């Protein structure tokens, strides 16, 4: 009993490590694959399920499926299987040796935090566990206690305003347009170039196109009229089969969906008017200290030039007599885990766990009252 | 009950032996001969049928006929007769002593695998038998689990892609241009030299011309224009009657039919565009690992310089940023049997037989569900 | 200038006629044939290309090729040749006399609609033309403005939800399993009966087997176990050479691929879970009016008993408190053209053309903004 | 330069005439005779070689020899001598006045068409010449462009399928059982009556027996059992020396060799299974139009009742749901020349000659590329 596990179960990518380190020892996607062909070799019951890095190598013959949809775990027969791969096959530690700090998104169903709690005790038998909130932990990474958290992950995007210690739950604006629904819009606009990426194996190619050749336009129409002279923007990507694709104005139209959700047909507003409408529901005296502290996190805020368009477009919405400072640390991808490393290494937290003894006599409703 | 028979009934040449050896103990062609003349000696009912090595010695007075057409057994009164010659007269073992591993081509009719099964139990009374696939067994010989199998035998040629354990049945491209239909094109282009090889006895001479003086051109037109100066290429063959033939540009035009099936008038493409079109129907993530593993087998890939023209012409079709590696072992003629020796000598296979007891209560549809 | 041409260039069968009629005056397949043999008669340069009904009569000596793959035109040297056969040799009208209403599939590449537009002006010099969408025009035939369109043609199958005027482009689920890829599965399951249909000339025989003896099972396993007593289902077809085939359980396994795309190995779902997953991405208030309006069209919805299995299997997926009404008109094969006859005969459309004058000053990007 | 010569050099009988006529002006056998006795008169060097009609009158003292064996010219010192008799002594025209249309059998050696070409220019100095194929020219006589040609001449018999313009070279079934090898079987079955016809002078008597008293049985065994009551079939022939022969069942057993090549010991099948096996190698879509067009030609199809047994025995081999129509014109002996008269009298052919000027700069390989 020395250190604690921090198993950030993201909606698209599991991050796990130890309390204290500044880099997780387990980065692999939340993929549980099933083979779908015949299998004529002598390995009949040989590796019926591939999890994580296994199902990323062998993905041409596997029916991949993300077990987590918008932060809501849909398949408990598979999310147990990633955790069994997480502790034994990748971290190589016993679950019974160390406590665990699980993370989840805010506004999740109340049956979701309980079913995570039921598994970590009745299956893995951990000593103690605490389920934090992913938007709280972005402050501990940046070293603040004040700000609003644009936590655009892979399954969900949600602004959470937090003033000096005190979170404001009546102003969380959740949005279900995230990195998984940008891939599905990118596969719909690569069809107009002729390239047909359809199945789940090609879905992991388009996600790799999105992480390499896709930026955010500062102004959208003037980058659109630049694509009329289609020579200075068409970058080329080299597929796993050796083919090439000449992708042009699809470089910037796929992350513009974060600012124009009418492209994929969502009746809401982008991440510049769900931040501005989450500050205009806070109190007027703390409205000045939230403009100067705009913490971003998540994978979907790793695009080139997303801190420019946030600062350019909130300023068009804010009253123009004071400043907007988008605070984007250059390692903000892992920032939910980095704050999870710090908070599990404090002194004022080692009494805030939930032990097995406390879980017995108080039941699974002891986890919802733990700081909401 | 110690070892197992592996009776590879090829479409033109029966290979039989024991499980464990690296060379079959029975190599003789699938020929059942009938005499066609009068027979004035006292041997009236003396040896009315000659099978295999018998009908290769006495072939001047016999009406030879292959019982197997394109892998499909056409005459069950003769294919029983080769097997009765196989077990007793050549292997000299009882059929009831050892199990049997029969091989057959993929995409054969479903009545063909059943009628082989009916004979091996109700006539020879073997303990157990398993009908494998000839394209699977080329991997066990080469020691791989990944690749596409150019299995150009004597009756049929078929590319079968197999990734790491899992075969892809929706991409098998079968082709009925094989070594038997190259003999019939060679007898049609020896007519233009004047030499008339017509009957079935001379058909076994032309097959012996094809196995000795016929190579594959690397480039076809530049070897054709070389034949204008007709002195440096005309090799001579010495017939069984002592005659000679001065064969020239017919050295390379008969195996060019494997790459130009429009010579014998087939509306398909050669073995370079049925391999390339069998990879372009596989999934895109396994398309890279099939280019680097091109297993060849069968007798018709024993020509001089066939690994050159495959590697030279798939490369003209593949995207030119990555490599093609034609894997041609120097004993690939027997490679269907060599893999049959290994697979019958495993530990994870000795439960995968089909016994007589299991065949009784489950009927002849128990053999089609056995790994397709 | 009285009427308009409606040239529905299908992926497998060209339909052309006049605006106003209820039956097209030109039904012939999209086939451009090249002869592949010697041609020893005096007709040396005599009819080097046969198009449509010509290449259906003489198909034994022709290398037929469909110019259109999945709605995407692959060979512009041949698609011009069908149109030159369409206007002059079959409709017998000048192209310069009447405007033209071309149709195409949704989610086609943006270079495909432009290259059709470039040919109809710069080669045939038509007065005006409009490129509609084939899924829109299925509503005008059925006389509705509300519904989802199962447009299972020959090259492509795509559900398009359309509410009262307003199409929903963020819910089109395209699928590349159509009538051409059912023929290729039927030629792979006639091999297990022994019958080898391989070349392109026999491909037009198997397509004629599919249109006559192939129905859809209501329940699949109970029609499969019916084939164990193989006497009451084996229908016979009489080939062009006078042979017969006794086809059994291949009557219903070839259109079951429309509901089980894992048979030909596609990692997607059938046309019952791409309709249900295209309604579950529409808004919840219009989800009730799409269940009661399920327009089918295309050739591949002409099977016996396809309206039964759609209504039987969406009902297993829908919430079971309200109704599903599959609307299948008994002439739904030509329904893309029937709606094209009506829409070219309206009053509110005769200003929605694209003239040659408007095409000059605005360029080929004037056709993509025309109602998407 | 008005008309053209058509010198059909048959394997047993030279036919020559002019382009336009419906009957050749030169019918005489291909016989070059040498005298073999002493010659005691004063005519020492008097007529050392007799050609054609000369060596048919004086044949009792001449060693006759056919210069052509199975279409292959064996003695160029004699085939020049027939042509020198053909142009000057029988047609009485200069060779330099008119072009020439030579005919030959298909599948002849490539040295045979060149050596004919070398003689017609470098010895006779004709203006232009074209070497056609004898099986093509049977269609022009019958006025068709579709059918299979049973061209049973004197040296060779070969089925050639020809569809609408386009010949199919991969289905020509050549057979070396023809009218010359029926004479040699007739001289072997007249020995059992006692009559010994042995030398070449008596060989021209047996050929005259075959052309007068030999028919084809419709059913063979029932005409054989009719010969048990040997009174109603034994016809009598009157020899040149005044003797008579009472020939019985040898009337029909000598042309039965055309349907039973095992009588003279050939390992092949008759002219009913080399026509049926030459249609079963054609494509399946043209297999119906070859059954209804069975053109016969050549001298060996002049027997009484050969159109009956072809139509009676292909029908036993064909699928019995459609018809067989043996098309036998009543002048089919000269039909190779009749088609040669028409094709040399066309307008689309007078550019398809091969002049002396074109032969100089292009060499003797210009004749093989001329429509194969
Ligand atoms: N460098 C990048 N640029 C753009 N998008 C990225 C990048 N890296 C990851 N992403 C997107 O973000 C997702 C990963 O975000 P992450 O924060 O790991 O999700 P989660 O909230 O589930 O942990 C990926 O699915 C990918 O689509
Ligand atoms: N050395 C050789 N070179 C070229 N071709 C060969 C050679 N040996 C055999 N063949 C051809 O390969 C055929 C034998 O192939 P094989 O693999 O025995 O066929 P099967 O699949 O029926 O066993 C023979 O008919 C012959 O035409
Ligand atoms: N009666 C039928 N039953 C089943 N399938 C049919 C029938 N008629 C046509 N088909 C299939 O539908 C295809 C024709 O569809 P069609 O509507 O012409 O496609 P498109 O017009 O989109 O190219 C044919 O290729 C055939 O496979
Ligand atoms: N009336 C006849 N009946 C049967 N056979 C005949 C008849 N006339 C000729 N023949 C045979 O046909 C041969 C002539 O065939 P022909 O077509 O002249 O040969 P080629 O094809 O070499 O010109 C003769 O050798 C003779 O044996
Ligand atoms: Mg995350
Ligand atoms: Mg083999
Ligand atoms: Mg259509
Ligand atoms: Mg002739």
Swiss-Prot record, chains A, B, C, D:
This is Actin, alpha skeletal muscle. It catalyses: ATP + H2O = ADP + phosphate + H(+). It is found in: Cytoplasm, Cytoskeleton. Belongs to the actin family. Keywords: Acetylation, ATP-binding, Cytoplasm, Cytoskeleton, Hydrolase, Methylation, Muscle protein, Nucleotide-binding, Oxidation. The modification Tele-methylhistidine is found at residue 70. It is an enzyme of class 3 (hydrolase). It comes from the Eukaryota. The modification Methionine (R)-sulfoxide is found at residues 41, 44. Actins are highly conserved proteins that are involved in various types of cell motility and are ubiquitously expressed in all eukaryotic cells. The modification N6-methyllysine is found at residue 81. Its EC number is 3.6.4.-. Oxidation of Met-41 and Met-44 by MICALs (MICAL1, MICAL2 or MICAL3) to form methionine sulfoxide promotes actin filament depolymerization. MICAL1 and MICAL2 produce the (R)-S-oxide form. The (R)-S-oxide form is reverted by MSRB1 and MSRB2, which promotes actin repolymerization.
């Amino acid at each position: 009993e020395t250190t604690a596990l921090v198993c950030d179960n993201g909606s698209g990518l599991v991050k796990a490590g130890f309390a204290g380190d500044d880099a997780p020892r387990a980065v692999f996607p939340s993929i549980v694959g099933r083979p779908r062909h015949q299998g004529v070799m002598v390995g009949m019951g040989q590796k019926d399920s591939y999890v994580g890095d296994e199902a990323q190598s062998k993905r041409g013959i596997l029916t991949l499926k993300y077990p987590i949809e918008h932060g809501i775990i849909t398949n408990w027969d598979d999310m147990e299987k990633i955790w069994h791969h997480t502790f034994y096959n990748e971290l190589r530690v016993a679950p019974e040796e160390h406590p665990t700090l699980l993370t989840e998104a805010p506004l999740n169903p109340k049956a979701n935090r309980e079913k995570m709690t039921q598994i970590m005790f009745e299956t893995f038998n951990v000593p103690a566990m605490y389920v934090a909130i992913q938007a709280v932990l972005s402050l501990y990474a940046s070293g603040r206690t004040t700000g609003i958290v644009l936590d655009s992950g892979d399954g969900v995007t949600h602004n959470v305003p937090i003033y000096e210690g005190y979170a404001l739950p009546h102003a969380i604006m959740r949005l279900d347009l995230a990195g998984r629904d940008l891939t599905d819009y990118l596969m719909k606009i690569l069809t107009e170039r002729g390239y047909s990426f359809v199945t789940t194996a090609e879905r992991e190619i388009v996600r790799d196109i999105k992480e390499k050749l896709c930026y955010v336009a500062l102004d959208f129409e003037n980058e659109m009229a630049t694509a009329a002279s289609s020579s200075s923007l068409e970058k080329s990507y080299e597929l796993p089969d050796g083919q090439v694709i000449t992708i042009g104005n699809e470089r910037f139209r796929c992350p513009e969906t974060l600012f124009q959700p009418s492209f994929i047909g969502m009746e809401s507003a982008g991440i510049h008017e769900t931040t501005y409408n989450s500050i205009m529901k806070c109190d007027i005296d703390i409205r000045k200290d939230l403009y100067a502290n705009n913490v971003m996190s998540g994978g979907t805020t790793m695009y080139p030039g997303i801190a420019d368009r946030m600062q350019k477009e909130i300023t068009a919405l804010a009253p123009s007599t004071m400043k907007i400072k988008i605070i984007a640390p250059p390692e903000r991808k892992y920032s939910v885990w980095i704050g999870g490393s710090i908070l599990a290494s404090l002194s004022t937290f080692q009494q805030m766990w939930i032990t097995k003894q406390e879980y017995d006599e108080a039941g699974p409703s002891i986890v919802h009252r733990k700081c909401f």
